Amino acid sequence: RWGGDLKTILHTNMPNVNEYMFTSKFKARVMVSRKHPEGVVETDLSQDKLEYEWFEFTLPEGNFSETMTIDLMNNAILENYLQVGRQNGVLESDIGVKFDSRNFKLGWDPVTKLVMPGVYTYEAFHPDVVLLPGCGVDFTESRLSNLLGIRKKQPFQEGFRIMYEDLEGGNIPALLDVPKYLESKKKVEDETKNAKVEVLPIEKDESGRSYNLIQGTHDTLYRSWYLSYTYGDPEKGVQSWTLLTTPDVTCGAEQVYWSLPDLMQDPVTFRSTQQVSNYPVVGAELMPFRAKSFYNDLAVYSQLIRSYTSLTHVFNRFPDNQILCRPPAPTITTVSENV
């Protein structure tokens, strides 16, 4: 009885995002059409029927540098937005789904329940999602969740669907407008002493896009998954069934199985099937694909430079809106390498 001491040399080169390995082709659910209320005031009040249709989105292959990928996906909802919505009347402030990385509750103050500074701190913390009511995302087939830094707590039960009602516990706080607060502070203090300041959330940005803040409250109809995870109920939030993890461009490292079919005798419980798929495996290894951690402080500063060099704003179509702006680059990330 003869035995062989198998040795194998493997070398591969996989693009970070591709149709295979399901690293591309994620699926979401966005607004498709916003009907007008017939016989009602148009600009005075815009509440009316809304529709939501599931769509599957695709990314161009080979776009590495996950800072790009999170951006490219955003670019795609905007593509769809464009076509379908524009034609059917959805607002541009109602994109619904957007991928970001900011910590929208960073400058939050418990007493005023408002973000005091007036801008959301542009420092990247971790990729997440921002969802309008009635919209959601899916990652059941596509493996972009691993890149997104979101992993399901109980993996086996099927379906990684994220819905607006699921992210219960975290809503993006509104922003205090700097001039109004400063005007009241200077006026009231100087006038009262020589001879109660009020705080107002920002209704909308400069371009006219509406932040759609909740009337009577300092929140908005935007539920950030990151906020729900940390600042939320551990049982009534995503903390119960969703786990935070470090994003990796490699999108995991599956195992490869080496089978030589007609040389090595089949292992214990394998039978000789000439199916293309099934062959008697002989060894198992991780793919030569692996992720190398890379770090540089000037990630945000470098991002601004790329905006000028690229000489186009396809990736920053909404500079005015703060919550719809371009997400910040992450200070520490990974770059895939083949060994």
Binding site: G107, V111, T112, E198
Partner: peptide
Amino acid sequence: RLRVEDDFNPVYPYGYA
């Protein structure tokens, strides 16, 4: 709206760095 007291102190250098 919300009315804070006379000497409410948000701790962000606000006017200028």
